[PDB]
């Protein structure tokens, strides 16, 4: 009956991980004006890398999600091509957040983002999604 407590839980070792938001006004602002590329760049500003608030993380993802949903397919390429490598890395992370809430065909255009982001960033950009300790 003693074998019921996981002593592992309280182990001298037991790896411990070492221990913001984009501005929604700015995003809406570019959105409402038809300035999609600019809305993208704004939405990928200041991700909440370090906060143990899921709320704040979902805030961020959703703001980004909204920018991506709003694009016309034939306009993704240039937008993605306007980013730098830290940009595409960050983007790919948000595309993978997108995939967790399909909602309308959103699923369908996220898949387009995925493809353009992959052409820019390579599979290495996905690798940094999986290896990220601190995520969106």
């Amino acid at each position: 009956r003693f074998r019921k407590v996981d002593v592992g839980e309280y182990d001298e070792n037991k790896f411990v991980d070492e221990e913001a938001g984009p501005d929604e006004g700015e995003v809406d602002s570019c959105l409402r004006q038809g300035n999609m590329t600019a809305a993208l760049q704004a939405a990928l500003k200041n991700p909440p890398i370090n906060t143990k608030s899921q709320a704040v993380k979902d805030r961020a993802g959703s703001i980004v999600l909204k920018v991506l949903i709003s694009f016309k397919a034939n306009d993704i390429e240039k937008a993605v091509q306007s980013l730098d490598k830290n940009g595409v890395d960050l983007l790919m992370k948000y595309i993978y957040k997108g995939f967790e809430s399909p909602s309308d065909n959103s699923s369908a255009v996220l898949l387009q983002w995925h493809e353009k982001a992959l052409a820019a960033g390579g599979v290495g950009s996905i690798v940094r999604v999986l290896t990220a300790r601190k995520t969106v």
């Binding site: 003693f2 074998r3 407590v5 996981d6 002593v7 839980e9 309280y10």
Partner: protein
């Protein structure tokens, strides 16, 4: 410290006090090599391989030596056996027929820790070892707990020392520190398993 010896015939816990072996407090385990082998014969039966208890004993011993190991967290091991096929190994019999062996690998040696499984009265190698230490002079206690050394053919199962350590820590926590998780950190055991 304490020598846990276990061969095909039998299993003794011998605590040794600086130079000389104290018969008082020495204990036997009524479970050993030949018993694990026979249990492995019962488990392989339920898996649809019927070895005769005499004609085939040598063959099942070789399966045991080759493939059995001690599970560290039994419920976690059962999940692995039940959800995946990673534990499943192929073994070639004397006549060339291939059998496949999975969960029985860790289940047979578990008799060592849960002797009720093979119909034996008692408490099993870790509970017995703890008892043996917690009956000795409250001050020799610690030097024993840091010199447990394994002996014999039936102590080489991969994972065995880790399972003991986990189990003592489980006992010590409840039966010495009645649930006190914070003062547990300072309990120090480290069975070694010599490569000889």
């Amino acid at each position: 410290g304490v020598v846990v010896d276990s061969g095909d015939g039998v299993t003794h816990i011998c605590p040794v006090y600086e130079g000389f072996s104290l018969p008082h407090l020495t204990r036997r385990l009524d479970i050993a090599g030949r018993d694990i082998t026979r249990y492995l014969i019962k488990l392989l039966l339920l898996r649809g391989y019927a070895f005769n208890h005499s004609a085939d004993f040598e063959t099942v011993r070789m399966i045991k030596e080759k493939l059995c190991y001690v599970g560290y967290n039994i419920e976690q091991e059962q999940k692995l056996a039940l959800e995946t096929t990673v534990l499943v190994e192929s073994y070639t019999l004397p006549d060339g027929r291939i059998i496949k062996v999975g969960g029985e690998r860790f289940e047979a040696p578990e008799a060592l820790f849960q002797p009720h499984l093979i119909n034996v009265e008692g408490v099993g190698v870790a509970e017995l070892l703890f008892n043996t230490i917690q009956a000795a002079d409250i001050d020799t206690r610690s030097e024993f707990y840091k010199h447990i050394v394994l002996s014999g053919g039936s102590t080489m199962y991969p994972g065995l020392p880790s399972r003991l350590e986990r189990e003592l820590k489980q006992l010590y926590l409840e039966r010495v520190l009645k649930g006190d998780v914070e003062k547990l950190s300072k309990f120090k055991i480290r069975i070694e398993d010599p490569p000889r």
